[PDB]
């Protein structure tokens, strides 16, 4: 008897580090499971076949499309994980204070490398051919997780949509499904490491001079 | 709502929407880039030199279940029985569709590594791989790819102006749907653009010309 029900990230501080739960077998537009081949990844279906015992478990990972807000309020996803943070003492004052700093010194996004479409001279059977240029902007913890931030035309309206998006692989989360497949609604943890939580905010303040205030206001807030 | 292609004093016709806004038929402007929507119901058209960057911009299709009677080959047929186009030009376009052996799907999706980094983030690009042709007359008639995974997509734009009536200077009425003459070049050239759009995609207005022939 399924009910209506929202697949959102649950972002808690339990004992000691700043903790996440994630579904893994509800594929949503934020949250989903991809496998990597060649750069790029591919999503996978977690229930049907059972996951690898080791031998490439490295190369699935969970694409989360997260964000730091989620009306108006500071208090969405990271924005959270990080107030946690802080208060907990997880995430120091210099450590903020580093980003605030990095924050002030930059002055180039991405939203600056702009989406454009360019005239090659070749031509496709008497037609013309372009080329539209999409700007991404890939990182990866040495642990294995990787940021990414991308580009677009802004839906309905003029400008631009920075994006950012995390992935973090089975191999780095709780449980692990070597060898298995997923049960019906199976949820992980995630314990969350200072850096990627400061490479989450550092994403954004170069994604776009919008973003950047937004991140360098939630965070001088904190203080 | 749908376009209601008609046939009126011996030159296809076409009426279009312009007042409900779907990834199908709707209403543009030209901020710097890419157009952006246009609340017709909100903002009355601009008339100095900015109604030169609205037009309409229509993902045509060619079939609806796979029904070959719809829009395109609504007015291919309905071209074909008037005589506004030939059985002879039909049969060039079979001829055309025959050399092409290489598609804009080809081209692919790719990701590359510009070397250059911001911030400590490395930087790359990925290519989406359009294709577009203009007309004397104002139509753009472009193709390019869109949504999972991406398919090849025909669009085509008409300059508002060369739409009926004058909507310069006022807002749409509850859903006013202007009128548009289809140039016969136009039908030729979307034609020929799903024919280059991909194999499928050629394969299928292929067996559907061939159709309207005695082939």
Known sequence: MIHLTSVEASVSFENGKIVVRLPITRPTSKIRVKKIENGVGIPVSTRKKSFPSDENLRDYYI???ISY???GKYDYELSRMVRLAHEHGILTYNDIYELL???DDVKSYLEDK??????TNEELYGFNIYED???VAKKELPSGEFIGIVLK???RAVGYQSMVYVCIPLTNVEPSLAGRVARRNEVVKYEVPVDLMKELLKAFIIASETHKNDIVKFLRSII
């Not at 702009?114 to 005239?119: K, L, N, T, V």
């Open 69 to 71: 807000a989620r009306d």
């Open 63 to 65: 694409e989360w499309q």
């Open 114 to 119: 702009g989406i454009r479409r360019e005239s």
């Open 153 to 155: 035309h802004k839906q």
């Open 101 to 103: 700093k990095f924050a």
């Open 133 to 135: 240029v999409y700007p």
